[PDB]
């Protein structure tokens, strides 16, 4: 039972808002790669160099 | 005492032979994130678009 929501859907979306097409994702390998595959995914779909 | 090699190491060896600077990283996550999160740090120290 997670009761934490899943913040990849809502990280997307505020990429997608501010029309960022190149941007830095510094990450810690803590909470997982998670959210990092989901901007590395959309990465090529709506082409960003991150 | 795991007997298999590191292949980080040789990987970014030889995308360094080649001399790719954009290439595709089709990974998938059962042997773990390290040979990925190895090609991405060099993806800016070495400024590749992976």
């Known amino acids: 039972i997670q009761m934490r929501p899943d913040l990849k859907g809502a990280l997307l979306s505020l990429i997608e808002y501010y029309q960022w097409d190149k941007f830095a994702y510094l990450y810690d ?20 160099q991150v």
């Open 29 to 48: 390998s803590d909470r997982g790669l998670s959210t990092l595959q989901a901007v590395l995914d959309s990465a090529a779909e709506k082409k960003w």
